[PDB]
Structure formats: C-alpha cells, structure tokens
Amino acid sequence: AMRQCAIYGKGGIGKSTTTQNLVAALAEMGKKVMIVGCDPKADSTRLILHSKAQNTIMEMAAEAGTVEDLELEDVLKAGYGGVKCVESGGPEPGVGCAGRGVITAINFLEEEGAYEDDLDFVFYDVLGDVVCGGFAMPIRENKAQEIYIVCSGEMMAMYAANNISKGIVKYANSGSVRLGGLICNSRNTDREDELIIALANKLGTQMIHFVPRDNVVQRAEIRRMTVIEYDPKAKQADEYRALARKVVDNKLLVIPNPITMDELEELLMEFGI
Amino acid sequence: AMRQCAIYGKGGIGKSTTTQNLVAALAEMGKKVMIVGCDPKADSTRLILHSKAQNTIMEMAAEAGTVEDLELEDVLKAGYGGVKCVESGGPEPGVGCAGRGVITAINFLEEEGAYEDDLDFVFYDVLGDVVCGGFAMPIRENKAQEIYIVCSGEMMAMYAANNISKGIVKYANSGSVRLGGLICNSRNTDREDELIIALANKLGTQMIHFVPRDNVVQRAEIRRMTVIEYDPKAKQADEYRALARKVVDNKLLVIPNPITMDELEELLMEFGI
Numbered sequence: 001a002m003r004q005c006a007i008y009g010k011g012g013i014g015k016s017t018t019t020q021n022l023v024a025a026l027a028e029m030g031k032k033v034m035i036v037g038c039d040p041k042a043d044s045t046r047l048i049l050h051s052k053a054q055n056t057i058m059e060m061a062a063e064a065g066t067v068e069d070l071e072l073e074d075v076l077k078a079g080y081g082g083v084k085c086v087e088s089g090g091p092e093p094g095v096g097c098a099g100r101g102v103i104t105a106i107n108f109l110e111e112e113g114a115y116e117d118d119l120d121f122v123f124y125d126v127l128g129d130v131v132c133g134g135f136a137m138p139i140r141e142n143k144a145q146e147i148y149i150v151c152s153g154e155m156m157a158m159y160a161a162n163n164i165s166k167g168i169v170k171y172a173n174s175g176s177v178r179l180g181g182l183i184c185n186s187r188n189t190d191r192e193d194e195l196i197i198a199l200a201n202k203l204g205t206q207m208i209h210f211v212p213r214d215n216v217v218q219r220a221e222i223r224r225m226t227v228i229e230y231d232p233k234a235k236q237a238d239e240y241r242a243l244a245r246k247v248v249d250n251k252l253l254v255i256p257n258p259i260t261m262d263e264l265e266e267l268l269m270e271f272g273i
Numbered sequence: 274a275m276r277q278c279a280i281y282g283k284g285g286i287g288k289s290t291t292t293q294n295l296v297a298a299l300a301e302m303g304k305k306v307m308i309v310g311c312d313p314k315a316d317s318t319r320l321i322l323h324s325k326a327q328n329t330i331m332e333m334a335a336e337a338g339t340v341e342d343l344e345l346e347d348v349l350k351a352g353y354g355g356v357k358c359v360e361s362g363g364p365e366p367g368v369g370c371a372g373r374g375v376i377t378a379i380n381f382l383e384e385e386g387a388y389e390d391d392l393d394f395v396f397y398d399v400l401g402d403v404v405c406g407g408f409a410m411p412i413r414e415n416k417a418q419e420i421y422i423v424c425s426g427e428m429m430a431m432y433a434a435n436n437i438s439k440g441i442v443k444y445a446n447s448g449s450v451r452l453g454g455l456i457c458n459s460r461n462t463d464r465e466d467e468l469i470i471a472l473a474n475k476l477g478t479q480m481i482h483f484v485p486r487d488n489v490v491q492r493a494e495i496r497r498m499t500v501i502e503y504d505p506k507a508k509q510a511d512e513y514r515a516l517a518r519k520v521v522d523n524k525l526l527v528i529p530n531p532i533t534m535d536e537l538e539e540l541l542m543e544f545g546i
C-alpha cells in the first residue's frame with residue numbers, strides 16, 4: 001500500500017517548503033517517498049536535490065521528441081534520504097493552459113511504473129489559486145486521496161482553502177478524494193492558531209499542525225536544503241517532525257463542508273485578525 | 274479618448290484594494306472611471322458600491338436565460354464618485370476554466386456600448402497567478418493597453434510580475450499592450466522600495482508608487498469603503514492620491530525584458546530581504 005497525498009494552497013503560502021521538509025522528516029523516519037511537482041514555478045524539489053530546480057517532463061519530452069521517448073530512469077531523480085523527485089512543468093505564460101503539464105506528467109508516471117510497491121507516500125505539490133485544468137486533475141481523476149491545504153490567517157489563504165474544498169465536494173460521487181487537514185503556516189499573528197482550528201471545524205476537518213514562522217527556513221533554503229538536513233537540531237526541524245508524525249497517524253479524511261464568504265468574514269472578525 | 278488599464282498581480286497582493294482606492298482618487302479628481310472585475314473572488318467593486326460584493330455577469334446571465342437577455346443598464350452599478358462597476362464571475366471550482374467568465378464579460382461590455390466616449394479610464398482587476406484562458410485575454414486580445422503590476426518584496430510576487438511580463442512580450446507583435454509600471458504594496462520590510470525599483474529597472478519599467486502598509490485600510494474595508502471615502506484626511510488617502518496623479522501623468526509604456534530566476538534570487542540576496 002502507498003498513500004497518495006496532495007498539498008494545495010495559494011501561491012507563496014508555503015506549499016513547497018512545507019512539503020519538502022515534511023517529506024525529509026518522513027525519509028528520516030525510514031519512509032520511501034516520491035514528490036511530484038505540479039506547480040509551473042517548478043522549484044518543488046530543489047531542497048531535496050540540492051539544486052537550482054529540476055528540468056521538467058515538458059522540457060525533457062521536447063528535447064527527446066515525444067514523452068514516449070523518455071525513460072523513467074532518466075526522469076526521476078533521488079536526493080536527501082532517497083526521496084524521488086519529478087517536476088511536471090507547463091507552458092509559458094500566455095500559451096495554452098497553465099496546468100496542461102500536470103496531466104502529461106501524472107499519466108507518464110503511471111504508465112511507466114513509477115508507483116512501485118515499495119513506495120510509502122507520494123506527495124503532489126499543486127498550485128491552488130485556480131481549481132481547473134491540470135490543477136484540478138489530481139482531484140477530478142482520483143490521483144490524490146488525501147488533500148492537505150496549507151493556509152494562514154490571511155483571508156486569501158482561507159478563501160483558497162474553501163475553494164479547494166468545493167472542488168473536493170464536486171467530485172465526491174466517484175473516486176475517494178478527501179480532505180485530510182489544514183496546515184497553518186504562521187504569519188506570526190495573534191490567535192492565528194485558533195482561527196485555523198475554527199476554520200477547520202467549520203469545514204469538518206482539523207488543523208493537523210501549526211508551523212511557526214522561523215528564519216532558519218531562509219538560511220537552509222539559501223543553501224538549497226530542507227531544515228531537516230541543514231540543522232537537524234533546530235526547533236523548526238522538530239516542528240516538521242511533529243507534522244510528519246501526525247500525517248502518518250491521521251485517519252480523518254472527510255468530504256468537507258464549504259462555507260460562505262459571510263462565515264469567512266465572521267471568523268476573521270471573531271479572532272481579531 | 275479613454276485609457277484602458279489593467280491591474281495584475283498574485284492573489285492577496287493588494288490588487289482590489291489598490292485599484293478601488295486609486296479609482297476613488299481619480300473620481301475625486303473629476304475623472305469618469307469604470308472598474309471591470311476579472312478575478313473569480315468577485316469582490317473587486319465592493320468598496321465603491323458599499324456592498325458585500327456585486328452579482329456577476331455569469332450569475333445574471335444564468336437567471337435571465339442568455340447573456341444576450343441582459344441589458345447593460347441592469348448590469349453596471351455606480352457607487353462612490355460615480356464610478357461604474359461590473360464583475361465577470363466565473364465557474365465554480367473544479368468546473369471548466371476559471372477564466373471563462375472574463376471573456377464573456379468583456380465581450381458583453383463591448384457589444385452593449387459600455388465604452389462610452391465620456392469615460393476617462395477603464396481598470397480591469399485581473400487574477401495573475403496563471404496567465405492563461407480568460408485571465409490572459411486582456412493581453413492576448415488587446416483590451417488593456419497599460420498594465421500595472423502590484424507586487425512586494427515577496428519572491429512569489431516578483432515571480433508573478435515576471436510571468437505577466439512574459440505574457441506581454443508574447444503578444445507584442447500585434448496590438449499595443451505594454452507594461453506601465455510596478456506598484457509596490459509594502460510588507461513593511463527594509464529596502465523593499467529599493468528592491469522593487471531595481472526589479473522595475475531590470476524589466477525596463479519603473480516603480481510608479483510605493484504604497485505603505487497601513488491599518489486604516491482594514492478599518493475602511495470593515496465599513497465597505499475606500500480610504501479615500503472613509504477618511505479623506507488619512508495619510509494613506511494622500512498615498513493613493515499620489516499614485517493616481519502618477520498614473521494620470523505616466524508616459525512610459527514598454528515591452529518589458531523578463532529576467533531569469535537567477536536574476537530574481539540575486540535581487541533578493543542583494544537587498545538583504
């Protein structure tokens with residue numbers, strides 16, 4: 001068995017930093033993990049690979065001829081803790097549909113046998129500002145059974161969480177895609193933990209972890225590393241280890257209850273944000 | 274003559290607050306303005322209308338039958354300073370293409386004669402996290418000659434500015450869409466103004482204004498108002514008046530020079546952000 005898991009959220013909220021650090025903690029635990037980057041920014045694997053980024057399936061298929069000319073062993077790259085890494089890529093701005101590379105990438109990985117019996121987790125790191133095209137494919141096509149949404153007390157971040165939840169509800173008649181939790185990536189504001197707990201309760205899920213704001217993240221990323229690898233003794237490393245443990249142990253996977261904009265504003269007003 | 278102008282930027286960066294306050298300052302000056310909301314969040318006109326939001330063209334067309342059953346005089350709504358307001362709307366998450374309502378809305382406004390000779394400015398408030406579908410239409414179809422990008426010292430915000438600039442370059446062989454400036458919406462960090470000035474220079478444009486972070490914005494928006502209307506004596510009101518004056522006077526409209534990710538990282542490292 002392998003758990004297929006997707007991290008969604010608005011741009012800049014912390015998806016890639018949280019995913020790579022969570023996955024490094026899982027690898028440190030002994031888990032076998034693959035990360036699939038599903039964001040056109042295409043830097044979702046750089047901290048595992050010690051790299052600038054990673055060349056994308058779209059780019060390598062263009063140089064090889066067709067995606068069928070690619071070999072899986074040439075595409076997947078392994079970094080810290082044996083974590084396997086791939087990036088979808090996407091068309092240039094103003095060309096096509098920004099999510100089209102996600103569809104190509106996931107289908108290629110499935111056909112070529114990337115989902116080996118020994119994997120324990122797959123994490124898709126998915127752009128969440130719009131829920132359409134290839135960005136909706138992990139939900140629409142039943143690729144990620146467990147959705148975790150990174151958010152913060154920011155109204156735009158909560159709105160994105162609600163919109164992703166609406167997408168999960170829309171496709172709940174087939175497949176098994178469920179909301180697994182909210183991850184609060186702190187903005188260092190008062191009552192932010194209480195706010196995200198309250199939002200999670202309204203949606204029917206949980207806050208699985210509150211990740212503090214900590215400059216050690218910037219120091220590790222300047223060096224192209226997760227905090228887990230950069231400073232295994234850091235307080236923040238223990239935070240990502242706590243998140244990883246709770247993901248491993250989580251059994252709450254729900255069809256969420258999306259809320260109104262009125263309810264979002266009321267949450268913001270209540271907790272004096 | 275009327276100047277057609279579009280405000281782009283990543284989600285949550287300040288597009289709608291900046292646009293509505295800029296436009297209120299223009300109206301206070303004596304200009305006739307229309308705002309066209311091109312973001313599925315659909316709250317781009319609420320501060321002009323004193324409202325929760327505004328019902329969208331997509332919603333009103335569905336209740337009327339077809340978009341052709343709608344009358345322009347039923348759709349456009351006027352608020353503070355006579356500013357005219359409309360919202361595109363868009364499909365629900367997981368359905369279709371998130372930008373499809375923008376195409377319907379702009380075509381409807383053009384066919385029904387909304388671009389009256391007496392207008393001085395039209396501002397489109399456009400989602401900028403992806404540059405595709407209806408979100409690319411103002412650029413691809415030559416609807417907004419002057420693009421202003423709201424950004425901040427945040428790396429994701431600068432990346433979005435670069436991606437929008439790539440979209441402008443892609444379509445520069447026809448039409449007349451140009452980059453008019455960057456607007457820095459402050460995160461209250463050191464050297465942020467210098468950073469955005471440097472980014473603008475690399476792209477070939479300018480920082481047209483540095484908007485400070487100021488809690489009066491939240492106090493005005495709780496009351497469904499621009500700062501211009503809520504407290505005309507506020508320091509922040511004068512900031513939006515300065516931005517409006519510089520937009521009126523701006524003559525620099527360029528085909529930008531998009532930069533590499535290496536150059537973005539170097540900018541961030543230089544200014545110690």
Ligand SMILES: Nc1ncnc2c1ncn2[C@@H]1O[C@H](COP(=O)(O)OP(=O)(O)O)[C@@H](O)[C@H]1O
Nearest residue numbers: 011012013014015016017018212213214215217
């Ligand atoms: N807990 C944290 N503490 C400090 N900085 C953080 C934290 N989480 C994210 N960041 C920083 O925030 C920025 C955006 O994070 P990233 O994971 O790239 O966002 P996304 O993938 O959602 O666009 C990065 O510079 C990252 O280093």
Ligand SMILES: Nc1ncnc2c1ncn2[C@@H]1O[C@H](COP(=O)(O)OP(=O)(O)O)[C@@H](O)[C@H]1O
Nearest residue numbers: 284285286287288289290291485486487488490
């Ligand atoms: N200069 C500012 N000072 C204080 N708060 C601001 C400022 N600009 C924007 N905000 C707040 O930031 C949040 C997001 O702004 P908004 O214009 O809705 O972003 P967007 O339209 O780009 O998604 C809102 O709560 C808004 O009140």
Ligand SMILES: [Mg+2]
Nearest residue numbers: 015016039041
């Ligand atoms: Mg990312």
Ligand SMILES: [Mg+2]
Nearest residue numbers: 288289312314
């Ligand atoms: Mg907005």
